[PDB]
Amino acid sequence: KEQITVKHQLDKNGTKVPKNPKKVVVFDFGSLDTLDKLGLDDIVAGLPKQVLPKYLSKFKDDKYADVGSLKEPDFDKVAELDPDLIIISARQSESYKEFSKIAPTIYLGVDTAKYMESFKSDAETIGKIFDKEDKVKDELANIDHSIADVKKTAEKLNKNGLVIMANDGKISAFGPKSRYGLIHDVFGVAPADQNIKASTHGQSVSYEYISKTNPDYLFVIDRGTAIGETSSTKQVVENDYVKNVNAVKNGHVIYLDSATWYLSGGGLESMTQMIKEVKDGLEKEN
User: How many domains does the structure of the chain reveal?
Assistant: First the structure.
């Protein structure tokens, strides 16, 4: 069977994978949605179905094996499927060795310090494996065009933005190079606070922090909503304390699709969606 050498984060010298694999187990939802965009649903053997973003609900179909959750893979079930390729990302990073004993495994997570570089590389890798290089090239081109358009819109406004995630009432902030840094790094929104320490969990902040930052646009992700726990966005954004924040009083709170933003991202479909949510937010009147 014809093989292709795939350089990835967890083996920069390259992992041999079969060309046109037929039984792929996918633990990265971005990668899953790239496969979907390329019309490759048929070769997905399994994915973790514990929680699925709405745009991926089709994958509840029993033709796809449930291999657990993003943080708790059902390794025996993965092995049972006799997969010919496994795709993982950051949440399974430490289990690379375990997955590799089952089948060739590649890591396709975005590097938020180098978002577009890693995004394009991941997509192109999928293109090469499944003989969809031209389709990927064209899709990346359209995405670049959409990104240029949102960036132009963001820069026209002369306004800034703060990105926060709510989690059972606790708030954390995300700036450049962070998990949700792309809103600034890629989409061009000026950061209301350049100095937020980049991380995956975000910088813990208070309501007083939102007030002192006074962002013109407020991008909100709700971790609770994403994972099926209680939402806590309204207690934050409709709190009396921040009623005078620009984003709040001017109606520029942008409620992102939390499930997609938290559980997914980094794929052709999720990126397309994410651009449009930001663009729509930035284009709203008032």
Answer: 2
* Distance in angstroms (rounded) separating the CA atoms of residues 91 and 89: 6
Whole-angstrom distance, CA of residue 246 vs CA of residue 252: 8
> 35 and 80, same structural domain?
yes
Cβ–Cβ under 8 Å, residues 83 and 25: yes
| Cβ atoms < 10 Å from Cβ of 216 | 18
Q: Are 265 and 200 in contact (CB under 8 A)?
A: no
Per the CB < 8 A criterion, the answer to whether 200 and 234 are in contact is no
Q: Which residues contact 254 (CB under 8 A, 6 or more apart)?
A: 217, 218, 219, 220, 277, 278, 280, 281
* CA dist 177 → 14, 57, 184 (Å): 26, 30, 8
125 shares its domain with 263: yes
**How big is the chain by its Cα radius of gyration, in Å?**
19
* CATH code of the domain containing 94: 3.40.50.1980
Amino acid identity of residue 173, one-letter, is: A
* Structure method: X-ray
What does the DSSP assignment read for 228-252? TS---HHHHHT-GGGTTSHHHHTT-
